[PDB]
Ligand SMILES: *[C@H](Cl)C(=O)N(c1ccc(S(F)(F)(F)(F)F)cc1)[C@@H](C(=O)NCCc1cccc(F)c1)c1cccnc1
């Protein structure tokens with residue numbers, strides 16, 4: 001019993017983190033095979049971060065200008081290129097600790113573990129959701145850039161996120177491992193709007209299923225509803241519309257609990273319209289939307305990697 | 306910016322987890338040097354868990370009855386003993402991945418990372434506090450026993466917790482690595498009272514400092530108070546008494562923020578007496594007490610290991 005925001009075990013990702021230095025800028029890189037991946041803003045100086053011409057900046061740089069360090073071991077750079085917003089540094093040595101891995105572009109509302117790093121060394125590990133507005137609410141200081149987000153499936157690490165920036169609002173923006181930003185963000189120090197964020201409805205419902213599995217039942221009501229009627233209420237409270245695909249994905253939790261998805265939708269409506277009345281669910285006084293239905297099933301049947 | 310419940314990176318602990326089997330019971334063990342540590346209830350059968358005589362049960366067992374497996378590699382058991390509630394299995398091989406490590410008995414209100422395991426394999430990693438009543442609010446299924454709690458200081462892992470049991474209430478009890486239970490708990494299937502839990506006041510105050518550092522300031526009031534007066538209010542809301550040692554430990558956060566500790570105490574009193582009025586602090590609609598003042602300082606200056 002119990003339900004917690006659990007990260008993946010970070011050991012396999014720890015073995016790939018390196019430090020990348022170019023001039024005076026130091027940030028984190030990801031060493032897979034004989035390639036090191038890092039944010040291209042490593043080549044930027046303080047005077048060019050307002051409007052960097054990355055193609056012109058990268059031209060003033062050669063392989064020897066990139067200092068890559070894995071622990072105390074200095075790697076030798078034999079090639080550099082730019083892919084979208086990431087730099088790929090070809091090194092003379094294949095990482096002996098390279099795990100089985102893919103690059104994945106995650107969809108909004110999916111979750112992943114962040115290994116926050118400084119100077120190529122790990123600080124800590126937390127579970128995150130890609131918000132509908134393609135930001136994350138993380139914990140990231142100066143130097144955390146190049147820290148990565150991942151999921152694990154048995155032995156394969158699926159990298160989905162590289163940390164690039166903090167917006168003036170205090171939320172976090174980054175790219176996939178091909179260097180394409182999630183959302184409309186660019187890698188320069190200019191004001192950027194994340195836009196209206198919404199609550200991941202399917203995830204809140206997964207969490208209400210988690211709650212019932214663990215004996216929090218007080219919010220279960222005698223009412224049912226319709227996708228259309230529920231969705232009229234979703235839009236009012238800035239919740240993502242619920243679709244039959246969402247309903248289909250909750251099916252295991254429905255089947256487990258014998259609570260029909262639309263009956264949980266009616267429970268959720270009463271909470272949105274009435275609040276929690278100073279009560280709590282799984283230790284929160286708010287509705288939690290950072291657990292996918294896969295995250296509930298994983299946690300509740302004790303899936304190992 | 307941002308503030309999150311961050312666990313330590315789990316790589317060094319992953320390399321020490323093994324599976325321990327005795328008869329039909331399988332649980333997790335911790336392989337350090339040539340010793341494997343596990344809950345002694347590994348020797349118990351379903352018919353003896355209500356009132357195990359551990360000394361009599363262990364007598365019916367020999368080294369060959371203990372099956373220890375690190376990945377697919379079967380370890381050879383050349384000695385077994387019982388220390389309090391843990392079994393120590395001497396194996397023929399020193400763990401090649403043994404990290405620099407100590408055993409530590411943690412104090413109530415201290416925090417640590419749990420690597421939840423099944424069949425000697427990691428599921429995930431989360432940050433926990435030892436509650437004042439010596440329980441933890443974790444996520445643990447059948448088979449999670451032997452999962453460990455730790456803190457890291459640069460390169461040294463300090464193991465503080467081994468998971469033993471779930472109480473009928475759904476909270477979690479365990480031992481230090483010398484097998485001494487935190488709290489009054491025993492390792493048998495009998496009803497056991499955790500007792501009244503209290504809120505870790507010093508930790509709530511650290512978290513209010515974290516909140517101010519990150520720009521949540523709405524709860525800051527024009528009132529001050531006294532340790533004695535604050536403590537009159539603490540006892541009413543089941544909060545631990547605040548002592549000058551607590552005040553002393555918050556000093557860095559005081560000094561950083563220029564908010565006197567007793568001024569934060571007055572802020573906290575107004576919240577306890579008035580509630581949050583549907584507002585939120587660092588994304589919670591409740592007062593959070595699972596960050597130590599050391600956890601705030603770590604997270605806010607980006608300490609790596
Ligand atoms: C990267 Cl190691 C880092 O921590 N950055 C960072 C620094 C510079 C740039 S860039 F170079 F790419 F010029 F473009 F600016 C990106 C990221 C910190 C950071 O985000 N600095 C800029 C903050 C800012 C201000 C106004 C408008 C913006 F879009 C951005 C950083 C600090 C904390 C967390 N992550 C990153």
Ligand SMILES: *[C@H](Cl)C(=O)N(c1ccc(S(F)(F)(F)(F)F)cc1)[C@@H](C(=O)NCCc1cccc(F)c1)c1cccnc1
Nearest residue numbers: 332346349354445446447448449450470471492493494495
């Ligand atoms: C250990 Cl792998 C495990 O998951 N246990 C467990 C099983 C047996 C015992 S024992 F053997 F030591 F006999 F003593 F019971 C301890 C722990 C699960 C568990 O706790 N089972 C007993 C539950 C229970 C019921 C009533 C009163 C009690 F004190 C205990 C376990 C399940 C989930 C999380 N942790 C442990």
